[PDB]
């Protein structure tokens, strides 16, 4: 067994480079969380109280810790939905919404777009039309899923619309907030949601894997269903007291999370600046305009024309950013990019934008 590959593992460009990966933008730990990591390096915080506060923070009835939004989707589909039930979700749903549904032994129905290119906006009104066609068959819909903000275009959807429809037809509503909770303010009852999942390492300034599952009192007896052999340990939660590092980083960054959501427009200001400034080059913002989230997807025809006459092919954009200390962009892909400037200082925002302007100009 070779142990040389584990020795020099401490080599990364996490501080010498500016990461533009949308997935890792809201999962950056502040200094208050790093101190907590030190205090619990070897691996008794108020867990019970934190679960009450996170509920009030989301305006929900109950809440429980998970190992991410992946777990949160599986918990509900397995405790609420019966094997064989249908899950109706938007077409821009994350891949984990299909995998978990297949793991919970269910079926999936997708909701088409209101318009594709370039908006790719989900038809929230079309949700009812899909369910009716399933009930008239008749297949039984057990869950209505909606990715509040997708991970391809970063589009925002009126969750209250789907939540109002779900209530009329009496079908549970899971609002996927992996790209929502922690960044922008979210109200559970206001959007008429029965379930809300979050990604602590994507939007709540915590380390992976970590997540939160908030739910209503209506389903409280099923999710928090206690075991028979042990009348204390929860079944779906596997009776974990939730100890370790990601849960501590979540609680340590929580006051930072609760304070940065009120200054969410200041992060959209950074976002909209990037869009309005890069559109002078030749980039076209895909998705809903203007941007309502930090996750931006630019169509870049310019980068394709350069990649056809540059020695480094489509990898010229990844290399030219390495020279300027910028990362987070898929290498080889020049047709369209996916970036984000959430949490970045405005000096760094200018640094990123000015860098790209110099790349497209120097590379002809």
């Amino acid at each position: 067994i070779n142990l040389d590959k584990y020795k020099n593992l401490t080599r990364s460009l996490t501080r010498e480079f500016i990461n533009l990966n949308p997935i890792q933008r809201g999962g950056i730990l502040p200094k208050e969380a790093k101190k907590a990591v030190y205090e619990y390096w070897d691996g008794c915080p108020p867990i019970k109280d934190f679960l009450e506060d996170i509920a009030k923070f989301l305006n929900m009835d109950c809440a429980r810790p998970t190992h991410g939004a992946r777990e949160g989707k599986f918990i509900v589909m397995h405790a609420i939905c019966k094997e064989g039930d249908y899950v109706v979700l938007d077409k821009n749903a994350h891949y984990t919404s299909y995998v978990a549904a297949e793991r919970a032994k269910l079926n999936v129905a997708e909701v088409g777009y209101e318009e594709e290119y370039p908006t790719y906006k989900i038809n929230l009104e079309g949700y009812k039309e899909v369910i009716d066609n399933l009930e008239d068959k008749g297949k039984n819909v057990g869950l209505i899923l909606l990715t509040h903000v997708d991970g391809e275009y970063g589009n925002l959807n009126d969750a209250k619309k789907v939540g109002k429809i779900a209530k009329e037809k009496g079908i549970p509503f899971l609002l996927n907030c992996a790209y929502t909770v922690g960044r922008m303010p979210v109200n559970g009852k206001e959007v008429k949601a029965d379930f809300i999942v979050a990604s602590g390492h994507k939007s709540m300034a915590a380390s992976a894997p970590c997540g939160i599952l908030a739910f209503s009192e209506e389903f409280s007896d099923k999710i928090t269903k206690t075991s028979e052999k042990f009348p204390v340990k929860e079944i779906e939660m596997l009776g974990c007291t939730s100890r370790g590092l990601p849960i501590v980083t979540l609680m340590a960054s929580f006051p930072h999370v609760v304070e940065r959501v009120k200054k969410w427009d200041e992060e959209l200001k950074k976002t909209r600046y990037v869009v309005d400034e890069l559109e002078k080059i030749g980039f076209k913002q895909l998705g809903i305009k203007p941007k309502e989230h930090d996750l931006i997807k630019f169509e870049t025809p310019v980068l394709d024309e350069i990649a056809k006459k540059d020695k480094r092919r489509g990898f010229f954009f990844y290399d030219e950013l390495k020279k300027r200390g910028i990362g987070g962009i898929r290498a080889g892909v020049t047709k369209e990019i996916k970036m984000s400037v959430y949490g970045l200082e405005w000096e760094q925002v200018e640094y990123v934008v000015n860098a790209i302007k110099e790349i497209v100009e120097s590379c002809k």
Partner: protein, 68 residues
């Protein structure tokens, strides 16, 4: 020299404070990426963390026969 070190006790509190200050100084690696160039005002704030840290590290060495 470290060879002149005498037996003594480690001040855990002073070591915790010394290591905390270096954690707070680590934020400058993120917020000032990638050039890491500070102005006069950013230098005063950063160097204040490095100096105070050494003031805690000196107190640690004091318990081993080191005078300052």
């Amino acid at each position: 020299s470290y060879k002149d070190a005498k037996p003594g006790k480690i001040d855990v509190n002073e070591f915790k404070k010394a290591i905390y200050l270096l954690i707070e100084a680590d934020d400058f690696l993120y917020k000032k990426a990638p050039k890491h160039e500070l102005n006069e005002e950013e230098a005063k704030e950063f160097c204040k963390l490095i100096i105070k840290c050494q003031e805690h590290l000196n107190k640690i060495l004091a318990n081993f026969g080191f005078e300052f």
